Amino acid sequence: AMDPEDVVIDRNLLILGKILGEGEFGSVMEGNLKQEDGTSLKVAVKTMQREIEEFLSEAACMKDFSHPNVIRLLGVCIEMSSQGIPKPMVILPFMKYGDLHTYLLYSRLETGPKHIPLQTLLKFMVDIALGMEYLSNRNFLHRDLAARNCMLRDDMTVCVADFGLSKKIYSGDYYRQGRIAKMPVKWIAIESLADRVYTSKSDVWAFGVTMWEIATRGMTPYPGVQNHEMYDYLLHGHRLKQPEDCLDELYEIMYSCWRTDPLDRPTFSVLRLQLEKLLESLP
Numbered sequence: 706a707m708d709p710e711d712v713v714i715d716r717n718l719l720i721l722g723k724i725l726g727e728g729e730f731g732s733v734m735e736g737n738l739k740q741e742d743g744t745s746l747k748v749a750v751k752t753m754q755r756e757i758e759e760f761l762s763e764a765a766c767m768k769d770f771s772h773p774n775v776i777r778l779l780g781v782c783i784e785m786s787s788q789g790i791p792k793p794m795v796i797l798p799f800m801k802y803g804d805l806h807t808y809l810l811y812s813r814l815e816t817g818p819k820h821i822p823l824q825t826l827l828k829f830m831v832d833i834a835l836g837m838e839y840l841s842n843r844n845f846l847h848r849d850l851a852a853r854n855c856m857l858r859d860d861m862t863v864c865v866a867d868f869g870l871s872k873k874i875y876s877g878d879y880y881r882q883g884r885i886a887k888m889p890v891k892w893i894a895i896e897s898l899a900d901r902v903y904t905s906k907s908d909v910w911a912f913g914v915t916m917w918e919i920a921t922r923g924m925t926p927y928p929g930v931q932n933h934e935m936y937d938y939l940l941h942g943h944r945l946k947q948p949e950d951c952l953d954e955l956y957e958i959m960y961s962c963w964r965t966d967p968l969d970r971p972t973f974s975v976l977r978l979q980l981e982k983l984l985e986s987l988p
């Protein structure tokens with residue numbers, strides 16, 4: 706617990722509020738972070754072997770991310786459960802609107818946000834491509850890019866989030882392998898399905914799936930196809946079908962993310978420019 710990058714926030718400064726989400730590998734909770742001047746701040750808390758010092762170093766590296774389309778880590782708190790075991794807790798800024806996937810579903814209800822215009826849908830994709838272009842430059846592999854892991858800020862801009870399964874290219878990954886094997890198969894590139902080996906081209910494939918999720922307003926990828934058939938399905942050349950009212954140009958941008966050879970897929974900088982140009986060409 707040396708903490709050379711000063712990422713740890715004193716546990717006494719944090720009071721855990723209500724639970725927002727609960728999964729097999731942890732939970733998201735509301736919280737108040739008592740700032741130095743006595744003012745409490747609204748934050749979200751992510752709760753959960755390998756030496757915890759490595760977790761803090763990765764957290765410290767993400768704390769240095771400065772891009773409006775990438776969530777910013779505030780710090781880490783350590784909790785001692787049952788019989789003296791250090792359990793880290795990621796402190797994130799509180800984001801009212803929640804995840805993009807749920808938001809898209811809510812928009813199809815009379816009570817939710819109004820019908821999302823095509824230009825707003827295309828702007829969500831540009832925001833994700835900008836965040837992914839920034840992470841891609843820093844040699845970061847997200848490895849879990851999906852609309853459910855993109856957060857909506859209060860000003861309605863999207864940011865890429867959920868870096869629990871991330872890895873810097875060339876860095877160690879042994880203690881993440883168990884969690885990687887349980888990842889949803891419908892977002893995984895054809896070459897990564899075989900042994901769960903990822904490249905930046907695996908994130909490009911998942912970005913195309915994320916674009917299709919936004920264009921269909923929250924549909925689960927591949928209707929009619931079960932998870933156990935996914936590898937065979939892609940092996941036969943089949944891909945996500947064109948969503949209704951999706952511009953043929955937009956669908957071509959998504960289809961380029963799913964080319965069999967990872968080297969044939971474009972980069973996030975190319976995708977980002979194509980989406981910004983497509984967005985400019987509309988009323």
Ligand SMILES: Cn1cc(Nc2ncc(C3CN(C(=O)Nc4ccc(-c5ccccc5)cc4)C3)nc2C(N)=O)cn1
Nearest residue numbers: 725733749751763764797798799800803866867868869
């Ligand atoms: C119903 N509702 C829910 C909400 N709000 C939320 N719900 C979900 C989330 C997701 C948790 N996220 C996230 O980034 N986790 C994450 C990031 C980094 C690391 C990590 C791991 C190792 C090393 C370094 C870093 C681990 C996990 C986003 N955030 C919020 C929010 N921020 O307000 C509002 N309404």
Ligand SMILES: [Cl-]
Nearest residue numbers: 927928945946
């Ligand atoms: Cl489909």
Ligand SMILES: [Cl-]
Nearest residue numbers: 945946947948
């Ligand atoms: Cl089609």
